[model samples]
Target chain A: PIVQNLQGQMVHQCISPRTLNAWVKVVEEKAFSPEVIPMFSELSEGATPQDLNTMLNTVGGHQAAMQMLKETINEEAAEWDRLHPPIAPGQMREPRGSDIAGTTSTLQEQIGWMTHNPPIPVGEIYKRWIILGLNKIVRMYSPTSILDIRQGPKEPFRDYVDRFYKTLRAEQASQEVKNWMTETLLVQNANPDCKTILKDLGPGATLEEMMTACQGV
Target chain B: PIVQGQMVHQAISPRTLNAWVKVVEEKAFSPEVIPMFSALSCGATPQDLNEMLNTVGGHQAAMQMLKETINEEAAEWDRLHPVHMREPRGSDIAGTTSTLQEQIGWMTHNPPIPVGEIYKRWIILGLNKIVRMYSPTSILDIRQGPKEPFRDYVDRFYKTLRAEQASQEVKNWMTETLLVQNANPDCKTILKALGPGATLEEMMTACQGV
Candidate 1:
């Protein structure tokens, strides 16, 4: 049902030809692996199984395909839906882009389910399953910031040190940022005597060395 | 080297009998997985491979043991070091707590590397690798809040819609809070006419409906 003959030109039943064509153009422009190009053709022609196999087997295919799908859903699905409303009731409810992009499942599991006898179109699979998978992957790790850390007075020095290190480790900052902040953040949150002592020890002091210096107070 | 007999006592070298005993005592008090108790005795005897296998094989053992090791390093290692310091002058520089608790890998990986020659003590394995694995696992997810959603007037409705849904989906708010806030906050930042228009339509519509 994803494909319907319109004006003798083969096109997506719900999504515009322009939307699908643009996606294909974008993927082609990105220099995707040669194996992936056929899948886009298959998508426009309205079948998706072979390309999915390509995604699972091809190196970097899964990631690239998933990202493209995620961007498409986030940026364009609403407009597509507005132009062409969802399938009518009593018909099988094709999954929504939101639902597909929101689910949390492994790529294998997603592809496994989508490969059911009533196979989904490659575009639908991309829009729904891959997008959702990407959503989960993208949001899985909420990066922590060094700026969020603070020390409590009653907190054990060891506890505070662990928190400080944990905060430092959790961030995605560069090594320069890390080294600079190693003593910098400690000083920012350090106590009166601890601050002065850590400053005296100067740069290149290890976290343990810093801790040893600070524990004196 | 971990299971050296000091007089009559078998214990972790660099880590005191008291420290190992306290960890064992803490594990027993915490009511860990039933299969894990044997590993504690193995640890006290000063071999870590079997307990690590137990950790790999035993349910919940990885998490509990990792947490205990992380806490031990953070709170007590420096103190333990004050008495024992790390290993010896030319001996294998036993992996530190900070190092173990700071690694980023899956449980299988840490255990796989640890289960090799010159087996680490249960305590050392706990401190160095599992702690790092646990540290990354613990800090992986950063939660999002609803209060932070502010609509820019110039942004496209569809972009805004996707943003709204993504923000709504990312949060851990209660359904009641979600339902109440959905229209409430939308109204809070909505434009003059759009605000008047949307309020004209009541709630009970889906996010698509609303």
Candidate 2:
């Protein structure tokens, strides 16, 4: 989303077809440059637009060529993956204070530039993840999970148990559990004090007999 | 965002809400017992359904009668900030190491948990900033000034020059200016090469002149 500040109010330009086309042209001419050339070359490799049209119009040549193209692309992708192994997530060690500080400084500087003249409204800056998730949920679920009676599907038994245990061990969980337990105790003790009266009390000769009588009552 | 994990996805029902209500009730019931009761008792004293309704309806009668809520919440918040503020970003200092290791360990323990069934996709996450400056032609106004253009250009040049004054402050400025001047050699060379359709020899001549 591109937003510009105009006379103290934010002007949001919606992504229309015309706007998208304009954006595509601008980005292609200025931003993309050498990055796009390699990909385009890989795609048709010296085949002109007229040649592509002829193949598409001719007797089933387009279909065969398309299939071959797909296979070639897949093979290339596989080769690329083989050459460059994927790094395992969460495999790196903890960064030093200096590293973190440097990164923070650089981020602050970049953010400062964007928010410099008149700072962008914090409320208007929506997270990309939120939009993505909302779109996915809306598209996948017709009525949407928000309106569902059962909320959502329950996690598998093993998974649920594991998550529960992990959550219990988390730093914030101790106080949370303590507060819950305390509330439980408070609720249980939420009754008025009662005075019990002992009836059928005979003339007690001894304290022990009186105690026994009380116990019996 | 709703994080759909293999284990637990979203938060369960009534857990967070119930917990909040419980805490509110505790504070209300034991106003004198707790140190931060003033802050806690702001909404409702008993946290009952009636009290909740009254609080929600903007009934301030009971709230006013109780001691004014101290800024104890701020103090408590301050105390918690130091402990919980470190991992502000999505990833911690260790990045994804701990999570990856745990996942591997889990797969080892639970054979039925399909380790190979997971499909991963990478996306172009973000863009870094691009740094650029105006070309020499753009900076110099040849149309406006011609007689003193050379002098003016030197005065307002991207490269720094030494001041006439002799002092510690002047010396520092001069040092920085000289450093900047020294660094311009490569930039000058590139600009000269791009300016003309001539060979490397012509570019070398232009560089020597600069």
Candidate 3:
């Protein structure tokens, strides 16, 4: 234990050197190249900084590991590309922030794509990514980005549920209960005949129970 | 059109239709009862309607008709309980299940149904309504006269047979019956060989007489 205090201190320094050699050996057993792992694959992009740290550490050299990381990323990307070919480089027509936002491709898909097919070198795009990416796409898709939605004027309860559900991406049972209760409560005597629905449900209600009672009323 | 609106001066058949008409003729059927007579013309038995005054006792007739109606309703209720619905489509079929449960719950008769039976009925009905609904494109989705072809037609055809498929029966007959109609001379040759349970196909093949 006294000797291992020095050893444990040097543990982070070795990165994943021991594990990397074993994985590399497993690849060799499978007749694979001793190439580096993909740095920008979903395995990388979806991964945390610690994941990349372990990866970079595994190669046993800082600058050498970074080089192999780039090589393997490129190689793995090439392999994935060979399997799932991309669309043509397309026309050189310029597309704006709004164009990307309003296009058939979603912002999620756009960001997902950038992370997906990497080692494709986006130098200015890196500096420009969140800057350009956060524009119209953010306002359109993100839940926080909603403009004020109002219903209760002369609109009925059912239509209110429809509009409210359409606005939200998530509609769990409790959320549905809230939508129903909020509409009926706010709407001017709209559900006066339907008070028993909520009264029966009390404060806490499942969506199945709420819908049944509401529909029954 | 009134001249064109001709009724058969002679009896069409002395079975259900004729028996029903004899009952209708006994009553002072007004123009209001013309529709009743019209229903009688279409093979609705007077005995079934409980309008049978002297012929069959009204008490027995009423009981019989009431029992039959309840049986049909009960059978229909029974069939509806074991309904099949795919999830999203299952939701739609399930729309009526609650109503069915409520109505079946509230239903009263000579003997009130026990809570256990009502619960069982409710479960059965819901299960029936929550059927294996298909998304049309799903593999369990094959339906034709709507079903996957190339299998035994008997299985598929019988499986798909319903009131909706009743039209196909007419469709089959239309192909066969048009040639063997009132004016068609070849019907004699076709009708001669038509024994018990002869099909439209049999009649069709016989029409060809090859």
Measured by lDDT, the strongest candidate is: 1
**lDDT (10s digit) by residue, model 2, range B1-210:** 011113322222243234334434542322111212111221111112122223322224433322122123223334554424122111111112224333333333444221211111000000000001112232222221323222223334322111122465665454334322332545344544455343322322333334
Candidate 1 local lDDT, B37-73, one digit each (tens): 2222332321333333333433365657765654554
**Which parts of model 1 are misplaced by more than 4 Å?**
A1-73, A76-145, B1-210
Q: Residue B58's C-alpha lDDT in candidate 3? A: 37
Tens digits of lDDT, candidate 2, A30-149? 332222222322222222222222221211111222222323333443443465443546333222222221222232232333344554321121121112222322232132211111
The TM-score that candidate 2 achieves is: 0.14
Q: Give the range where candidate 1 chain B is weakest over 10 consecutive residues by summed lDDT.
A: B151-160
| TM accuracy, model 1 | 0.25
lDDT of the candidates, in the order given: 0.39, 0.27, 0.32
Q: Isolated chain A: TM-score per model?
A: 0.35, 0.16, 0.25
Give candidate 2 misplaced runs (Cα > 4 Å): A1-114, A117-127, A143-217, B1-62, B65-67, B71-210
Model 1 lDDT per residue over A121-204, tens place:
434645344434333332332423567666676555678777777656634456898888876777778666677787888877
Top model number, TM-score: 1
Worst 10 residues of 3 chain A by lDDT: A31-40
